[PDB]
Amino acid sequence: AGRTGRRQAIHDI
Amino acid sequence: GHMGNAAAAKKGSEQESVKEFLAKAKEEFLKKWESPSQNTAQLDHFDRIKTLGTGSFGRVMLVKHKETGNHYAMKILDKQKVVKLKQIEHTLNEKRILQAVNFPFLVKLEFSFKDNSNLYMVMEYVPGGEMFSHLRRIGRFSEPHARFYAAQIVLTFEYLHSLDLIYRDLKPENLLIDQQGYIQVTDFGFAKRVKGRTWTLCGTPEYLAPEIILSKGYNKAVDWWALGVLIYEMAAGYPPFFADQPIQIYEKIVSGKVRFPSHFSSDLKDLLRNLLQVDLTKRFGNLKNGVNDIKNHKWFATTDWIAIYQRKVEAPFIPKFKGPGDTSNFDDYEEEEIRVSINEKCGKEFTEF
Numbered sequence: 064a065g066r067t068g069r070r071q072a073i074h075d076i
Numbered sequence: 077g078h079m080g081n082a083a084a085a086k087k088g089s090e091q092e093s094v095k096e097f098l099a100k101a102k103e104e105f106l107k108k109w110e111s112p113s114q115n116t117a118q119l120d121h122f123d124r125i126k127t128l129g130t131g132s133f134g135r136v137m138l139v140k141h142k143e144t145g146n147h148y149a150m151k152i153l154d155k156q157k158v159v160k161l162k163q164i165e166h167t168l169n170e171k172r173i174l175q176a177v178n179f180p181f182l183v184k185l186e187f188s189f190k191d192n193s194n195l196y197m198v199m200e201y202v203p204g205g206e207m208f209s210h211l212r213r214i215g216r217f218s219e220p221h222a223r224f225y226a227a228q229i230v231l232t233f234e235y236l237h238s239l240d241l242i243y244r245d246l247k248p249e250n251l252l253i254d255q256q257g258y259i260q261v262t263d264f265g266f267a268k269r270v271k272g273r274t275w276t277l278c279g280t281p282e283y284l285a286p287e288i289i290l291s292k293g294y295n296k297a298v299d300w301w302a303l304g305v306l307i308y309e310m311a312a313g314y315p316p317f318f319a320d321q322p323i324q325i326y327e328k329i330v331s332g333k334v335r336f337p338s339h340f341s342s343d344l345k346d347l348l349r350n351l352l353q354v355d356l357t358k359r360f361g362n363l364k365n366g367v368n369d370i371k372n373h374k375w376f377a378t379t380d381w382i383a384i385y386q387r388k389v390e391a392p393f394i395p396k397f398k399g400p401g402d403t404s405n406f407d408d409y410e411e412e413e414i415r416v417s418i419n420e421k422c423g424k425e426f427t428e429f
Contacts, residue, residue: 065282065318065325069208071132072245072266072280073322074163 090382091368098238101178105239108176109269114429117187117198119416122150125401127409129206131265133157133167134194135412138201138403147401148186149202149262152414153195155422162276164425170264171197171429173241180387181232183252183262190429192420202260204253204395205405207310211248216313219341220378221392225251226307227376227384228259233303234367237296242270246302247283248309253405257391270295281322282315286330286354300361300370304351311344312337316352330354343375 079087122139125147129136134152141148158167174185174197187198207225211217217225229246236243244266252260266278273293285301287294309315316335317328334352336345350369353359360369371381383389395405 064320065314066320067212067314069249070247070280070282072247072278074166074266074276074278075160076277 087372094234098235101235102239104178105176109172112172112175113188115189117189117196119189119191119196119414122148122198124150124414126403126406127411128403128406130409133163135409138401139198140401147201148198149183149200151197151199155190155193155195155426158195158422162278166265166268166276166278167195167426168428169266169268171195173267173269174199174264177236177239177241179232179235180385181228181259181261182235183260188429190426191416193415193417195426195429199262200260201401202252202254202262203397203402203405204255204257206249207251207253207259208248209405209407210253210393210395211310211313217310217392219311219344219375222307222310223376223379224384224389224392225259225310226303227379227381229261229303229306230367230370230376231381231385232259232261233296233299233361236267237299237367240269240271241267242274242296243267243299243302244279245283246299246306247280248306253393253395255395255397256387257394258387281325282309282317284326284329287356289326289330295362297356297359297362300351300359301353303361303370304348307344307351308334308336308348311340316348341375343373347373347375 122141125138125140127135127137128149134154136149136151139148139150153167158164171188183202184200185197186200189196245263250261250263252262254260268274273295275293277288277291279288283302283305285294285298288298305315317325317332319325319328350360356362361367363369398404
């Protein structure tokens with residue numbers, strides 16, 4: 064099970 | 077050996093020609109990198125048509141240039157959402173790199189400008205849609221189809237890395253399909269000029285190399301890891317490190333043994349083991365022979381690299397195009413009017429844009 068929709072990129076953390 | 081005398085000579089000559097090309101490409105890039113362009117249009121020059129995609133800082137819209145009638149994709153960033161230090165620096169990277177590069181698989185920037193509230197980048201409109209939605213609709217691509225796209229990424233990274241540029245956000249959401257079925261890389265929001273290592277913890281969870289997750293200073297080899305993730309996802313339909321929450325994804329990337337679908341060819345699995353390699357002294361793209369370990373791999377044996385660059389190869393899929401300005405290949409998004417404040421916001425933070 065995992066993410067099937069569009070994935071946001073993360074700038075930090 | 078694997079190659080006879082004639083094949084080895086042809087390949088060596090091809091490799092020297094690549095070096096000659098890249099040297100000239102660096103000269104052209106540096107002229108534009110040292111002399112960027114700014115304020116080449118303004119908002120009221122365009123009619124805004126439809127939102128094509130959304131992100132944390134804004135949206136990309138189809139726009140129509142009023143005077144010429146040409147269609148473009150306009151990325152709009154709300155200056156007051158670009159709040160964190162690395163969000164600001166990354167936005168300046170994006171514009172400066174996009175205005176300086178030139179390659180057949182990189183989207184072409186046409187205009188950039190800013191107002192009291194927003195930053196704007198106006199690029200060529202690529203109407204065939206994102207690789208992401210074609211991939212999700214069909215499930216997975218066959219190996220020859222995945223290989224055609226992968227070859228374009230390999231050439232694009234060879235170009236970018238020769239200019240000391242790291243891309244840092246490879247994924248199907250960022251790859252558009254043009255009218256000839258070829259790829260256009262968009263979204264340079266994480267790209268950066270890096271002469272050795274860099275340290276920002278950024279990218280998309282499923283595509284992060286282990287050294288990013290582990291807070292190590294890292295280099296262009298993160299893009300080769302990401303290529304491994306992309307090829308796997310194109311050929312499987314899902315990426316290799318797959319879980320509902322980012323923390324679970326990170327644990328699989330650093331400590332997980334990649335498993336492959338039973339339908340992957342052994343040549344593909346071999347390439348992927350060498351790209352999805354946690355040990356940087358062993359990762360393809362990062363060894364003494366550089367990109368050539370990838371280009372000369374058995375999985376790419378049928379690839380005519382020059383013909384891909386020259387766009388001479390018949391694409392596996394041609395998007396349906398109903399005319400200029402057609403948006404049928406894009407998903408629908410909630411629309412929100414562009415509001416421009418009467419007061420300038422964040423003027424000092426965005427002087428260079």
